[PDB]
Amino acid sequence: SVLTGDNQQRGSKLFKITIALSPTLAHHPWPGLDTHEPSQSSYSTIVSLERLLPEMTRIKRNGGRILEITEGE
Amino acid sequence: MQDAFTKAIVAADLRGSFLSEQELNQLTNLVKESNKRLDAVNAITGNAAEIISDAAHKLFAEQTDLIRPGGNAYPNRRMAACLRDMEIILRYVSYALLAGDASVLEDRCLNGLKETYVALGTPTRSVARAVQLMKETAIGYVNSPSGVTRGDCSALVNEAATYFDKAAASIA
């Protein structure tokens, strides 16, 4: 997701992370095995340096892996 | 407590006004029906014992478990209660019918009845059922008397129903 502006109101240096998405990370609210969306196999979210550690760790434990990290700007 | 007349008053009071002529005409006509109204009540009271007796029989024929060991109408003690309760509800309904207002029945009996029944473990469902059974029997009498001047009681009959139903609903 291309950042239209700095997403985060609280301000630090912001990094764009692109992740391969497990079904767990974004299960659809459906009966049977939850399926992450087809359209976005790779969600891409800008993240403040402060929240970057948590976000990564949570991504890691969930199947999905970091395709690539890029500074937001 | 409250009744049709008193009620209208109270409303009028908060507006701060004399009664509207329109409003009088509600009461004026209400008066006219009195005689019918009364006989209706009289019919219930006259047949009371029966109404209940009847309803009970039917209630227990249907829900045989109530009267089985482990059920709620067993043993005697409980059974007695259950009969007593039915009666009460009836009594209140009648009261309302005369007043021409639900208030008395709801405040004196219904408000909190459900929860009581719940706490005890009485199945509210069945209670409601009984109330209906009663309703039908009661109407039966109200609507089919002998030696009364023949005419139309429907208006009253329906109001009667409603009262029974408020009961059924709030209990249920």
Partner: protein, 273 residues
């Protein structure tokens, strides 16, 4: 307790008073020091309006003190229907969402995130809405912006105590009610050191979030239906936290921000630490 009649036979609004009993007020007829009975440390009577004044004074003139008074009409009312929260409903924001579908997620998000609390047009947040619908923000990220907004702090966090703000958060961000004091304590500490922003993050960051309504699903009420690792009491708590539809969390009401879940109830489900 349940009251069985709303009004006295003579016309009169019954009020239910609750007091802490005292040995003077009622005592066993034994020899030795006078004791009340333990199970009635908090006693409750229903009194007509007329006798209310005298009854209350007597209670107070003895060692008694009045925990609370409440009209018997409000009391002796149904526990709130759970019809609408038994099955929440659930809103998904698809990618390439229509103009309308984005709207409907926004509304839902306000409703859940703010409690039935009304949000005025001036209160609403154009900027964060603007981000949703051109992409760039998730539903989960929007939710994090709301709980960062002043509107959110003004209502839930600046009026009440942190202990209440916690459960108030538990409800908005997860359907669940809180389970065990441990949870309340951890949030209180996190708030002291990290501060308000970290606390908010930790709900949205937590595994229950994402495991349920992970991303791009507006959060919905999980409680009221059986959840994993959820004490039973929690289910009763939910009935205290959630009163009806068209019941809210309001700072606006008299003594607006109190604690629905008495601290002794939390301690029941699990005491330790």
């Amino acid at each position: 307790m349940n009251v069985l009649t709303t009004s006295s036979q003579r016309g009169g609004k019954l009020f239910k008073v609750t007091m802490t009993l005292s040995p003077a007020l009622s005592h066993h007829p034994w020899p030795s020091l006078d004791t009340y009975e333990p199970s009635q440390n908090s006693y409750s009577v229903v009194v007509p309006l007329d006798r209310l004044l005298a009854e209350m004074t007597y209670i107070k003139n003895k060692g008694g003190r009045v925990l609370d008074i409440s009209p018997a009409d409000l009391e002796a009312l149904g526990p709130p229907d759970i019809s609408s929260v038994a099955i929440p409903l659930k809103v998904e924001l698809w990618a390439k969402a229509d103009v309308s579908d984005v709207q409907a997620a926004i509304v839902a998000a306000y409703k859940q995130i703010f409690g039935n609390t009304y949000v005025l047009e001036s209160e609403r947040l154009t900027s964060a809405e603007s981000l949703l619908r051109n992409g760039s923000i998730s539903v989960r990220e929007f939710v994090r912006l709301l709980a960062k907004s002043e509107l959110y702090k003004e209502r839930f966090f600046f009026c009440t105590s942190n202990n209440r703000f916690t459960e108030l958060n538990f409800k908005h961000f997860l359907g669940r009610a809180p389970y065990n004091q441990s949870e309340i304590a951890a949030h209180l500490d996190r708030y002291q050191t990290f501060g308000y922003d970290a606390e908010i993050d930790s709900y949205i960051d937590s595994d229950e979030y994402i495991q349920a309504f992970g991303e791009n699903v507006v959060p919905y009420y999980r409680g009221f239906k059986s959840q994993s690792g959820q004490t039973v009491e929690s289910f009763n708590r939910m009935f205290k936290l959630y009163r009806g539809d068209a019941g809210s969390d309001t700072n606006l009401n008299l003594q607006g921000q109190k604690r629905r879940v008495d601290p002794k109830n939390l301690l029941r489900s699990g005491r330790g630490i």
